[PDB]
Amino acid sequence: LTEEQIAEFKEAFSLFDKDGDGTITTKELGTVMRSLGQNPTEAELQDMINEVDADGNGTIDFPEFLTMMARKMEEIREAFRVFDKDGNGYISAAELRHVMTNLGEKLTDEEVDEMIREADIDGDGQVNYEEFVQMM
Amino acid sequence: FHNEDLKHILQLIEPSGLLQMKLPEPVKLQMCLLLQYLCDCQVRHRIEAIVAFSDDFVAKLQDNQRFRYNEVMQALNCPCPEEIRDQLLDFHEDLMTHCGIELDLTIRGRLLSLVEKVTYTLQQLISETMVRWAQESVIEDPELVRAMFVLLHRQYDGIGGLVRALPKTYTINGVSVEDTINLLASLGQIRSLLSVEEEKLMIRGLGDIMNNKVFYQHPNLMRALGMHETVMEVMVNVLGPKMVANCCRFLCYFCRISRQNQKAMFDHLSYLLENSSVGLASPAMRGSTPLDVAAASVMDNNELALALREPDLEKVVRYLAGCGLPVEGERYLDFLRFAVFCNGESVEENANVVVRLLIRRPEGLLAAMEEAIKIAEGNAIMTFYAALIDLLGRCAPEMHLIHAAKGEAIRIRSILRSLIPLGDLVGVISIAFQFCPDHKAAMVLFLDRVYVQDFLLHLLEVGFLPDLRAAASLTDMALALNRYLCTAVLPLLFAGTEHHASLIDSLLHTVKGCSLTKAQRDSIEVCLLSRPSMMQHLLRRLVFDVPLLNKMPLKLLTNHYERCWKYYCLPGGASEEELHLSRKLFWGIFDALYEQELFKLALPCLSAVAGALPPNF
Amino acid sequence: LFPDGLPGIGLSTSLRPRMQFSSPSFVSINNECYQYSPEFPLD
Amino acid sequence: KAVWHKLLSKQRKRAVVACFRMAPLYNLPRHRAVNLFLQGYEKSWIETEEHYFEDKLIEDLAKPRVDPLHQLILLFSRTALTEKCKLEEDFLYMAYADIMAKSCSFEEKEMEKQKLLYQQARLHDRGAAEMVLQTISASKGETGPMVAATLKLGIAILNGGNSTVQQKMLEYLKEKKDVGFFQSLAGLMQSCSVLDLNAFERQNKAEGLGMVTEEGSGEKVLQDDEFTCDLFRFLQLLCEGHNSDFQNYLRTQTGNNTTVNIIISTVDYLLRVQESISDFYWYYSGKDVIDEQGQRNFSKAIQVAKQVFNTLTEYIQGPCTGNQQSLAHSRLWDAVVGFLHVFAHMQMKLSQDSSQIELLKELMDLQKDMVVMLLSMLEGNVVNGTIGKQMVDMLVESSNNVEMILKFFDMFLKLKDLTSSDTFKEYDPDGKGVISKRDFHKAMESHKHYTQSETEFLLSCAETDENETLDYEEFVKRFHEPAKDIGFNVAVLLTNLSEHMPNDTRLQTFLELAESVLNYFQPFLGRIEIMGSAKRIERV
Amino acid sequence: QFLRTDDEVVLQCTATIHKEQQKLCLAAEGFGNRLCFLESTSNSKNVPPDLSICTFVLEQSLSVRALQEMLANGHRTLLYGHAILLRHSYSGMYLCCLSTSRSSTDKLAFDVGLQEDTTGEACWWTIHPASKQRSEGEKVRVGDDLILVSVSSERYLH
């Protein structure tokens, strides 16, 4: 398997990891599902462990995580299609409401231009294609 | 009576004979039980074909709907807005959502065809011959009359018998046909032993169930056979030695295997707590009490913990009213710890109820438990008064602001702080450096929950006095070392030289390993929250640590305490000579060719601390 | 499931716990009667 | 910038969560696919109409010695006659006394009453009024599923107020001098129910962290209210038609050693329901967004509170003087004190929604079914009778809450007069079904009747739909119809106190209080005079 | 017949000390002593009780819910399960549960004196019947023996 997406999955594992000892408990999963808007309880966290709990340690190990992503799930290529609704790389001031709708964070009303204006190259009033290769 | 014989036998009774004649009473009673057998195998045939259609149908269903859903989530993904949540459900709820709306896809014709067959002979004649008997022949013998109308009602409601058939059937493979049989051979031995050594055949019977590969794989099956109630009514029959325990150990394993099993075992808690016949300890009977079944019934699930109510906890403290002499009282408070906490954070409802019933009868404690600390020629009191404290630490209102921004969680916290003094430092610091490890951690988890940094220095000379200096003394001392790595974490939240004396003793103790790194995790943030003259003095031992660094115990102490010394070098914003060797001996490791990529970034803060602050023995 | 009924069918793919038997002999293996039942001629 | 890189992690932190969650799709075990398929097939697809088969079957057993049906009832009586200090399960009984109970426009309205009375003749000819009267007296106080099945038979026999069956229930009790029946009926209501809120907020917190709840409705309302409704309905059917030998049998119970005053014992029950819903008001009183479980715990509690008033009436309805006197000395008055106090405060907050009309109708109806009772308690008054004297005495002891409901009816009746005045109709429109809010704030104000406080309460929601106006027909149909039937009984009850009991002065406070009501219904109530069975004359 | 609001009442037990029926009543002084004590009545034919400092006037009776919302910022009839604000009839101060510790066996017996501060749940006493016959929610008649439970300390009037 291509180790680019596996290194991306290691980055995603460390994104999920908070105690940093190689094992992921249930509480990291509960906090990451509560931080992205959703409201889980202990029952959903518990049996969602028990499905993945083939290793039988109550935690998420790394290679079973890797094949669990390799089951269904590029990463930023599928993410760039969220940016590119229009297909020309432009993410306009009008198109920015169509990108940030399905995230979870309440977008601001003045700082949203400062996110563009610091990142924009010449000031075309949009977010172009060139703000993806050398911005991420 | 295989295929040739039943044609001889049915067409002896059918032709359409035996049934047409006139018969006396206690023979047609015998025929009625015979006639029930034919309908029973008719029911058996209906289930054997309803599992036959099922395997072919889900082979059409799963190979369609799992496969065609895979086409949608590659053509639409957007992790889970709407169309995921229709297929994001429980697997039980997914089954009802898939098929069970068809009484308002492409296979909607096929299952609708089957119910037409399972609409539905001899149903005509049994409904006829029960009428023909009961009309002309005015009946005594109510054992017969009860037997007649059952076969009438079972005939007219053949659906309702099948309604109580499907929550007993179960489907498995050809792999399981080995271990299932001698399971059933053992289970039938227990059902046969229900009516009566009598003990040893049950113990031989129960353990052979407990070593089966098909005993964990299908706990729905073991629930559907009702074999929790089987062993329980055996134990119900025994109660008013080892025959009680060896079935009781099976129940504790029975609830541990799944949550949905444990809900079914909840409904027997009323009888089960009425057994103070076992609480005189004598281990290893402490894995087999009827209390211990009551333990594992509530043990984890917070849903189960909220459902139980006040007469359950009334009887337990009624037994604690009996303890006015003892040793049995430690196990009741062991049970109530599983009634209030259950996850790591307490419940808010049962925690209120138990302490209100713990004031209506009360039973200095540290004035009394100190006097028995040298009692010899005993410990069952020393764990008891440790247990009652360990209970009361669990029913704390909140470490969250529910304690802060609310009344009615303080009213009860006022009770907890009033019944005890501070007091416990009898057991916390003083006696606990000699029994040792079980009770000092128990007194911590009370004091942390109920009751800033002035008592940080006041409650020093604690823990690492005997323990962190005796790393080669290893055996109860060795059993205490990994225990207080995690207990000493929550003390994250002048005498700092003595703290550095224990920390260097902790550094020698850090010279299990996941928890030893956990006590390092409470140590690495400890110097960050340090007047910094001790933090500058602790960095002098860090150069003493740097001499013994440039193994893995110092390698985690190299890159961490270097940036932490820069966090101690915020005070500059004397011993830089040893710091010059500290960059030199690190450069002496740099020319030698692990986690050394961490310590290499710690070298630039060693010049930035000199750019901010300085501008085996 | 259907004839185009007869409860004397021979398929019977349920579990159906098996028969075992023992012959009432007079060997000195006295912890082997001990299992099932005395045998009998069936058919 | 930094928030641009902050969404890249929260994209992958959230997209991995979907691969954690969507990985179960019935994939690898073919056993768990098929084992779960059956249980879902059961609870969805068996469950159909077989229920043509009852009325053919009891027809098939009432055929030409002794009938086949006649032995079946004879089995259950002789089973229920032996002392075992307990009943059984007897799943034969649980199905046959169900099937025996499942088998029960003027000319059709009499012919349906005709063929029903034939179908209860099919059963009570053969002692079916005795297995219901014995299986209650067998189980001493236990509310098991057995005794809940007999009440569904005894209701489906007495269903029309049957007179011969009500004669056979008594004349069986008189000769078999049965203590064990009235000992059993008092113990049956003794626990029986109450809506408890400590089980609700336990579940409400369990609605917090117990995410999906399948059948957690068990301890919620009254512990199987369907039995508790069916107890009192069986008691009401024992007295409809005014069996004055039986309403006096439920009181003093003459020819026995000990006596069970069952009529006080049902007063003590609904007082426990009065407090049970007052506490379900007080907890609720500040949230003001009734969720789904808040609705279906009132609706399962209103109907039982509705039912207990309907059987409270039938002990009083025929003017048995020893029965209404013996309930006036009891603690009835505290219940109707409390029930008023729920009526005002809820209606001011339940009539602020478009979703909370479904609770409003039921709570309006129980107000009517309350005053239908204390109309019927009043009917033996003479002029200044004591039972008329005490009924006004509770009317000042909760005087402060009679105000709001009488004020509530005026808001929706004075709207019902101002419907065809053209400063109500042709003011803002010609006529369309759209008026205004802003002119409705002043077209109503140019009728000069109401204070400004009542105009804003009338301006509660009134459309919540895109217009900042209201609707003509829908608002007035909710104004006229649900408060003119219930409001009529309150007008009758206020009439009935003054004309029967004059020469009170604080009653003249209440009369001139609701003068807008009594001058609206006075073209609808007739006051005739008869010679009502006491050889006196009473207004009707 | 029914105890109501604003009627002078007294509170007395009848405890026996070696078969001597001491019909002691609760009294207090104030104006220099913020504590309560006992007054004896059994030797009434020789020593009469100083009844100026024994009598208490009920001032209010609330449901518990009404109390909890009231702290959050005509003669009525007294009911069980209600919190009452007892008033000393002479000294004007209200009976309360002081948060101090004196004149006890020194385990958790809090002190009962009489203070001035009307607010706070220290001066509210709930009434619980010593009878399974008469129950919660109904009116308390003359001579009904009962329990007084504090709202703040939740300790009985021992």
Ligand SMILES: [Ca+2]
């Ligand atoms: Ca982790």
Ligand SMILES: [Ca+2]
């Ligand atoms: Ca793991």
Ligand SMILES: [Ca+2]
């Ligand atoms: Ca554009």
Ligand SMILES: [Ca+2]
């Ligand atoms: Ca650009």
